[PDB]
Design a protein around this nucleic acid. Structure first.
Lengths: 111, 73
RNA sequence: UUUUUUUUUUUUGACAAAUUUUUUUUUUAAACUGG
RNA sequence: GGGGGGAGUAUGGUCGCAAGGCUGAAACUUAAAGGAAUUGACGGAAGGGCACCACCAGGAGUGGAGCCUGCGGCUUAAUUUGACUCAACACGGGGAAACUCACCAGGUCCAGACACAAUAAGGAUUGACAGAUUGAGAGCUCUUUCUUGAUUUUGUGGGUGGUGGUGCAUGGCCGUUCUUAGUUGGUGGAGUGAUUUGUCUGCUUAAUUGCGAUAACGAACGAGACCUUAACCUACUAAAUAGUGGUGCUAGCAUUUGCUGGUUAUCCACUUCUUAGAGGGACUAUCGGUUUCAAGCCGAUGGAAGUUUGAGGCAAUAACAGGUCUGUGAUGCCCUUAGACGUUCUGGGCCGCACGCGCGCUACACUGACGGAGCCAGCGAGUCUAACCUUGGCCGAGAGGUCUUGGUAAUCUUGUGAAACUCCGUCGUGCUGGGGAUAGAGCAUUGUAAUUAUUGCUCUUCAACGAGGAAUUCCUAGUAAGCGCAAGUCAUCAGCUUGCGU
């Protein structure tokens, strides 16, 4: 379980994701169920940007002992987003100004 | 629910087993060689002279029909 | 002119036995001519 | 001194009319007892904040009465069952006449795939008229004798199904901890270590929100930001599926040129009202006052809008043996699998009543009841190979019927002409013309079917209840409370819920 799941998170990070998270829940190696979660990067799950940048999937895998639950959340970064918003709502970018010349040579140029 | 009592009389009875008689297809045979109809054919246009009308008691009953052909005699 | 300055307390006993246990995986990317 | 007890006990000695000191075992029993510190939890410990699921000031009540609705109990052939503090009890979208349905009394069917073996073309097998029989027009089973033909039957293994069990074996979903502000890495520092600091004295905020302080620095999730919705736009884009004005034609009254109307597109023009795309708009703006002079807070003005503008949606880390196997062709294990726990059909039950509880409805009247008269919404839903929402005419006291019509919908139902409310009158402090439980008789409607009243209507019957003890719930502004309406469930049934307006 720990090898199959760390091989999925590292592939999604290799694919240019900003954060993804894999949860395996069920009777993993005992008779009493636990839940293991494997994560890298960061994920936002707060609001409308969840509808924009989060992709989720739930899968039922059928095992000898019972059923395990697979949950994968992937947060694609907004920089490579083609449509819709291209940044998180609280991300501000300041355009860097170009410095000017002080004296500016008081004169006239004509045509 | 723990068990069943079956207050009905102890009937594991089943249907008649499509009762297995001996060979029966016999019009009648005379000597060399003719045959004539007994248990006569039906008046159905869709029974093309191949069905035998059983005579139980004052009844003529066809089995090609699901239920009922009554040419009583 | 060290100058500032909320005074308090009635009654509240008890809750049977046992329990919940996590270990480090790659030995597997190892294949080349001598003309 | 040499693990904890037994035990400073027993015995002997000694100090002795005393309490009792001093000296001092063993048998037996036991897997820890203990020390210091850490993180939580808890405190009838303290300090600082916060919340109408807390109180204060109050409002509306509930608890008292009748009913109808869940739960317990009792009863029963069965009254199927889960859930029991918040976080079970109008909850399972659970308003069950059949179906649902899991329960009870009974009857059919296999929908037992495939593989092997047997029977078997001198027929493996299937179906049936009438009668018996049966609740039954079930050929169930029997009497009878036709039909069928290789798919079935029998046996051995399996297969399949199960609202059968286990939610303490699980998945998913959901509730709750938890209407709050909380949580965690990386590198550095402290400590042998568990851990700790970062994540903080103070002030501030709805907020681990900030100002700042600082053995920490730089970060991540949560909060915020975000999205939806409600308010503003005489601004843009134009609308016979929304309007307005003029114009023709026309009605009434006044007549003087006016007022009120009608005219499905008569025509023209426009977009204030309506619709919906793109936008604008609030940032606590301006001023004043306060604090360390910061983050902020308070008051006034302006403004459609000054509580985070109002309301939501979304929503961390860790968890609970919380609920659900009765949502699932989600599922492990167990059980059952042909006289079945599968499935289906007739009946019945889930509604049965000495009684206790929870959510509610109607009331106890004059701020009222009754009768006329006025007349005002918003959210929505609606039928093609199927009968949905129904206008209008006619009939009927009413419920309802019938003949037609419009609508697949900003077009028609529908301006949903809702109810409280308002005006005028009758009543007159009397359980009375308040209240309408219980009950009788009739007429209809839905349905295959209405008995154990489905529901509607008409006449009659006229119960308790005179403001509800201890307790206890919800609530801070277009809110509480009053008042109805649409939708869900639905064929019929709303005293329920989800919304909406007044």
């Amino acid at each position: 379980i720990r090898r199959a799941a760390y091989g999925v998170v590292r592939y999604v990070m290799e694919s240019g994701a900003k954060g993804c998270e894999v949860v395996v829940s069920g009777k993993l190696r005992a008779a009493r169920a636990k839940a293991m979660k494997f994560a890298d990067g960061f994920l936002i799950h707060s609001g409308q940007p969840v509808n924009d940048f989060i992709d989720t999937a739930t899968r039922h895998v059928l095992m000898r002992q019972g059923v395990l639950g697979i949950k994968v959340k992937i947060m694609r970064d907004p920089a490579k987003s083609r449509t819709g918003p291209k940044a998180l709502p609280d991300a501000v970018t300041i355009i860097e100004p170009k410095e000017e010349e002080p004296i500016l040579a008081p004169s006239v140029k004509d045509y | 629910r723990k068990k069943k009592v079956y207050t009905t009389p102890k009937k594991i009875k089943h249907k008649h087993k499509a009762v297995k008689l001996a060979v029966l297809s016999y019009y009648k045979v005379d000597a060399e060689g003719k045959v004539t109809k007994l248990r006569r054919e039906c008046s159905n246009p869709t029974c093309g002279a191949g069905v035998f009308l059983a005579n139980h008691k004052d009844r003529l009953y066809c089995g090609k029909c699901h239920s009922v052909y009554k040419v009583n005699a």
